[PDB]
């Protein structure tokens, strides 16, 4: 129809304003759904912040977790909160960086900070742990690329801290997750995991640049050598990324 409802407000103009109302509602819906984690805001001192944002918190939604792990309502107390953080405020006000009170990689703060996830391994559809070493995995083998097993591991400062003894794979997705490092006695004591995403595999060696040679002895360990829990996973991965800033003073200080 080619008639205007009033003035120059036709059916095309009516549909445009109908979408404006829908999009405004959609933006409100999308933003509130984004607030299921991390809120209330709080401040540097840890008290609840005076300001909470224009959008209110959404109604609680319940996740029916599989493998008999109970229910989960995201809007609520967060079980991933970390306590006794080793940080101090550099200013008495807000919006200023925190200064670690000790070793940032050891204390797990900043780039080295982890989250208090569940201390149980991730499980695939069958129920057994998702990530397992290839020795435990049945029928799995290297199909392409360079096999890192047996290659020496080079740290960020060029030190050889051991050789890759095994690599952990996600048999559910047929993807490599970690590489075990048999730490040399001069550097470490046992086996340490390094995620595949922070190690570059060359023809003759595997190089991790975030962590220096002296930081491998402090890499978090796993309770068992057959599986890794989500908490150990979070601690191990965060430690390597923390070395990108805390390996030496040069990395932390400005580059120019």
């Amino acid at each position: 129809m080619e008639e205007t409802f009033f003035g120059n407000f036709d059916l095309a103009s009516l549909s445009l304003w109908l979408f404006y109302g829908f999009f405004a509602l959609l933006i409100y819906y999308l933003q509130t759904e984004n607030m299921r984690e991390g809120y209330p805001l709080e401040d540097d001192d840890g008290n609840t912040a005076a300001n909470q944002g224009p959008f209110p918190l959404p109604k609680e939604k319940t996740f029916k977790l599989q493998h008999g792990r109970g229910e989960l309502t995201l809007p609520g107390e967060d079980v991933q909160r970390r306590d006794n953080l080793a940080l101090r405020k550099t200013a008495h006000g807000n919006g200023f960086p925190m200064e670690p009170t000790g070793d940032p990689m050891l204390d797990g703060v900043g780039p080295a900070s982890w989250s208090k996830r569940r201390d149980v391994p991730e499980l695939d559809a069958h129920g057994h742990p998702k990530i397992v070493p290839m020795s435990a995995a049945e029928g799995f083998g290297v199909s392409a690329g360079t096999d890192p097993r047996g290659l020496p591991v080079m740290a960020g400062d060029g030190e050889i801290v051991g050789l890759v003894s095994d690599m952990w794979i996600d048999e559910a997705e047929q993807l490599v997750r970690y590489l075990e490092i048999e730490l040399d006695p001069e550097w470490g004591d046992g086996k340490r995991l390094v995620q595949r995403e922070m190690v570059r595999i060359k023809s003759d060696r595997v190089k991790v640049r975030s962590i220096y040679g002296k930081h491998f002895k402090n890499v978090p360990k796993t309770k068992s050598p057959n599986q890794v829990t989500l908490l150990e996973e979070d601690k191990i991965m965060a430690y390597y990324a923390g070395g990108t800033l805390y390996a030496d003073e040069s990395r932390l200080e400005p580059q120019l």
């Binding site: 029928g139 690329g145 047929q174 490599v176 640049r209």
Partner: peptide
């Protein structure tokens, strides 16, 4: 430089995953 996760540098192939049921 640091490994940008754009191409997997090692592939593992096991038994084919026929899917859940």
């Amino acid at each position: 430089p640091e490994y940008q996760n754009i191409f997997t540098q090692v592939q593992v192939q096991g038994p084919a995953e026929l899917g859940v049921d």
